[model samples]
Target: YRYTGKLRPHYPLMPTRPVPSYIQRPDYADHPLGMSESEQALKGTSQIKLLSSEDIEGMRLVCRLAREVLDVAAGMIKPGVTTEEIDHAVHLACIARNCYPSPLNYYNFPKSCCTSVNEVICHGIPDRRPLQEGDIVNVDITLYRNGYHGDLNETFFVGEVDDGARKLVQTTYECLMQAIDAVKPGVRYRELGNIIQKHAQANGFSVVRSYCGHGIHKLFHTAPNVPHYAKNKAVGVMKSGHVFTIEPMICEGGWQDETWPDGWTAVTRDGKRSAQFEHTLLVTDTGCEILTRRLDSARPHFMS
Candidate 1:
C-alpha cells in the first residue's frame, strides 16, 4: 500500500508462533538463555565439523527436503502474494514433511522462513504486505530433519523486473556457484571469500560484510564463519566430510549494512537492492557436493 524506492515493511508484523512441544527441536530451544551450552562452546571458533558417512547421509536427506520445501514455497511467489502466506506455506510444508523449521525461535527469530525483499540483505521477517510486480524477494528456507539441518535460499522475481534487479540476482547466484566450484580437500576456507568477492566486484557489485555463511548441520550456526569479501581473514582448511554453506549476499550499493528494530532483518545502509544465494555443501575426497542444488523439476517456472 506504500510506495518508495526502498521497500517498506508492512506494519504490525504478526506475533511469533509456537512450535508444538512434541516436535524435536535444536538444543537452543528451551535453553531460557542465549545459545545452548553446546552452541556457546562453539562460539568464536573456526573449527569445521567433519561429518562421518552416516552424518553425511543424514545431511543429504535434510538438504533434499529443504530443497523441496523451497520449491513449494517459491511456487507461491508472484505479484499480490503476501509474505505471510509464504511463511505459512513454508511452515505447513515443513510440518507435512515431519520436519522443524529451523528459524522459528532460534535466537527468538519469529518466522518459519526468512522473506527478504529488495534492499533487505537477509533475515527479513515475513509480514502482511503483498508483493508487487517488478519486485524481487528472497525466500530463505531451512529445515531440521533426522537431527540434521539443511539451509538454502534463492531470490526470485515477483514478476517482470528491471535490468538492474535481474542482474543482481543472477550475479549473486553465479557467485555462489563459482565459489562452490573452488571447494575441495586442502582448499583454505578463506579462498571462498576471495573467489566470491572477486566475482561480485568484477560485476560492479558489493558484498555485504555484516553477515557471512556458517557451518550448519546438527547446530543451526557453528564454526567457520565464511565471509564473502576479498582479503577476509576467515581461518580454516576444508577437509573430506566438511559440511558448510557458501552463501554470498551481494549488494547493488555500498557493502555497509544496518539492522532493523526487530533485531533480525538486515538491510543495506544505502537502501539499494541486494540478492543472495546459498547452498549447503559437503567436501569430499575429490570434490564438493551441492547438497541443496535444485532439481530440474523443482525450479520455479520463471527461473527455468
Candidate 2:
C-alpha cells in the first residue's frame, strides 16, 4: 500500500452555511466546547503505551473499546441537545467503564471531550448552547484505558443544512478515507496532505492548516504532525510502530482560521462551516490498522 500521491482539498472559507442561533459566544476563550478548558492531575503518573508489531492484539482491544465508547456518544447527537450534555455523557461513559476521559484536564481543557459546532474549527467547548437545525457539529472523543489512549472524531449534521455544508462534510469524510487508503510502509507522513488538499479543492473546500494530525500512545499527544494540505513539510515515514491520527478539518470557505476570544475555539476566519473525521491508526510492516473503526456511523449524509 504505497501512497499514490493523489490530492484532494475540502472547503476553505465556510461562510456558505449559517451559524445557528443556538451557538452563542462562550464565557471563556479557552473552553473546550463552549465550556472552559480545565484539568485535573491523575492520581498516578499518566501512562501511555507505544505499541510494536507484537502489541497488535492489545492495540486492537483498545480500538474496540474506543469504538464502543464512540458509538454510545454518537447516539446522543440530536437537535435541541446541549453540547455540555454530550460532554457529561462522555465523562460518565468513560468513568463507568473504569476508563479515564483523556481530555478532562489534559492541558486544562474544561470539557471531558470536544464538541466543535458550526463555524468553530476545533476545540469548541461544550456549553449551555443547544444544537440547532443547519449546524454541523464535530464531536472529538479520546479515552484512556489500560495505560493506552484512543482518539478520534467526526462531524455530524444537526438537522437541516444547506448543500454547501452538506458537501463540505461529505467531502471531508471522503478525504480522510482516501488518505487512510494511501497509508502504507515507505509513505511519507506529508503524502497524506496532498491527497487531502486536492480532494477538498476539487469540491470548493479548503483544508485547515492551523491544526494537524498527531501521534498518540500512552501519552495523549506524541509526534508526526499530519497536515492535510498539499506541499506540507511534515516529517517521518509510515513505518511500523507509528501510532497516529489522520483527522482532516475541512472548511467551506477561506483556508485561513481564527481563534475566538476564548483562545481554544478555532473558527474559520470567514465564519464558514467546517467538518472533520478522525481515526487512530497503527502502521505495520505491510499496512496500517484502524483502531477507531467503531466510530463509523451507519447514516449516510444526504446533500441538500
Candidate 3:
C-alpha cells in the first residue's frame, strides 16, 4: 500500500463518474481541476446564511432524498461487499432521483459517497476493500438537487462486532445525539464541542480535531464553521433559518489523525478505530429540525 496504515484504501479509483445534464451540479463537479472555489473563499471566514421559505423547502426536499440514498447504501453493508460496489449503488440511487451525488469530483474526490471503514476518521474513498466480518464502516452521503444540498452519515456493523468496536460506535453516535439535542436559536456554535467532549471523554473516547462541520445549502460547503472540539473559535450563533452540519469524529485511541497519500482519506494516527455521524440541521423558531433524520427503516441496525 502507499501508506503505513494497514487496510489502506486501494486505488487507482475508478475514473470520475458522470451525472445527467439535467441534474444541477455543484461548481466543483465539472471543473477541470475539480476545485470548489466557493467553499475555499468561504473558508476561514464566518458567514451564516439564513434561509428564506423557498430555500427552506429546497433544503427539505434535498435532505429527504439524501436520507433515502443513505438508506440504500446502509442496506447493502455486509461481509464480502466491496465499498466500491456501495459507491456504485449510491450513484444509481442518486441518478434515479435526479439528484447529483455531491462528493463525486469535489476537489477531485473520485467516488459518489464516502465509505469510511474502521480507523478512518472521515473521507474514506470507496475502493476495493470488502467489508469483513466484525468490521464497522461509516457511509457519509451528500445529495444536491434543485440548488440545495443535504448531508448525513452513520456507521454500520458488518456480520458481527467485538465489544470494544461496539462500544466505540455507540458512544460516537451518542456524542452526536447529545450535541444535536443541545441545538437551538441563540446557542453559540462553539459550545457544541463541550457537550460532545464531555460525553466522549467520559466514555474513554476522544474527539477528532482536524475536520469539523460546515454550513451547507446552495453551496456544497460554506460559512459558520462548526468545530467539534471544545473551546474552538467557531463564530456566529444559530438563527431560526440557519442551516449547517455537525459531524463529530470520535476515536478509540488518541484523537489525532493523519491523511493518507491519496489526499482524501483520513485515518487515526494510532491505527485505532474511529466512528462518526452527521446531519444537516435547520434551526427552528422553537428548536432545530434534523433535516436528514432517519426514517424508521433507516435506523442503525448496530444499535439494537
Candidate 4:
C-alpha cells in the first residue's frame, strides 16, 4: 500500500471484464443520464434539477424506489450469482416501480447497476464475474422518476469478509453518517470532506478523493461536487433549500486507484480492498435530513 498525500484524478483502474456484444453500448448517448464523451465534451451543462419543498415529495418517492431496489438486490446476495444477475434484479425492481435505472447506459456504462466487488472501488460494470464467498461487493443503485433522481450505494458482505475488509466497510459507513450529521443550514459544504477524512484516517483507512457526491434531482448529476477528503475547496453552502449527497469512498490499503481500460470501473491500485456508502441529503431548517436513509440504512449498524 503506497501512501502519498496527492489525490489522483479519475483513477483506481481495474481489469476489464469484456462485455457481451449484446450489452455493448451502441446508442449510449440516447440514454438520459449518459455522461460519456458527449456530455463530458460539453461544459456548464446541468443534468439535475433543483428541488423545493413542494417537490421533496416527488424526490421522496424516487428515494424510496431506489432504496427498495437496493433491498431487493441485497436479498439475492450469495456466492455464484453473477454481478449481471444483481443488475437484472436492480433493473427489474426499478422498472417495476415505473422508474428508470439511472446507470443503465449512463456514460456508456454497460450495466443496470454498478456492482463493484472486492478490490474494485466504483463504477464496476455488471458482468459474468460470479461473486464468491468472503467477497465484499459494493452495489451502487440509482433511480429516476417523477422528475427526480435518488442515488445511494453500500458495501455488503458476500457470505463473510475478513476483519480488515469488515473494518474498512464499517468505517466507510460511519464516515458517511458522521459527514451527514455535520451538515446544517449554515455549515460550510467543504467542511464535510474534512470531517469524513478525519474519521476515515482515524480508522486506519484512506479516503478516495477523485469521485464525489453530487446534486441530484430531475437529472442524474448537478452542482456541489461533494468531496469526501479533507480540506477540499468544495463549492456551495448548506442552505435550507440545498439538496445533495455525501458519500465517502474508503480504501483499506493505499488511497491510489486505477481505472479499467473500459474507462468506467475504478479499483485499488495495490489490489487491496475498498468500501463506500452513499446517502442523499437535504438541508433542513435546523440541520439536514437523509433522504435515502432506510430503516436498515442499506448496511446494518456497527459500533466503532
lDDT of each: 0.87, 0.72, 0.89, 0.75
Every model's TM-score: 0.94, 0.80, 0.96, 0.84
In order of listing, the candidates' clash counts read: 0, 52, 0, 7
Ranking by TM-score: 3, 1, 4, 2
lDDT string for model 2 (1-304, tens) is 2211121111131121222233222222234443332211322223323476546665566666766776676777788998877877776676666666666645556567788887777887777777888878888888766656788887888878788787888899899999999988889999999999999999988889989998776556656778999999887778777788999999888878877555567777776778889999988777888888753555333322
Off by over 4 Å in 4: 1-50, 296-304
Model 3 poorest 10 in a row by lDDT: 1-10
Residue 295, candidate 2: alpha-carbon lDDT: 33
What is every candidate's alpha-carbon RMSD to the true fold? 2.3, 10.7, 1.5, 6.2
In model 4, pairs of residues that clash are 12-257, 12-258, 12-259, 12-267, 13-258, 13-259, 14-260
Model 4 Cα shift for residue 162 (angstroms): 1.1
| Candidate 3 lDDT (Cα, 0 to 1) | 0.89
lDDT of 1 by residue, 257-284 (tens): 8888778888888888999988999999
For residues 1-304, what per-residue lDDT tens digits would candidate 3 score against the true structure?
3453567666666766778898888889998778888777777777688899999999999999999999899889999999999999999999999999999888888889999999899999999878899889999999999889899999999989999998998998898889989899999999999999999999999999989988999888888788898888888998999999999999999999889888888998888899999999999988899999977754565674
- Candidate 4 C-alpha lDDT tens digits along 27-126: 3325565554433443364333346777888788888789889888888878999887788878768767877777766775756789888778888887
**Candidate 4, residue 23: how far the Cα is off, in Å:** 20
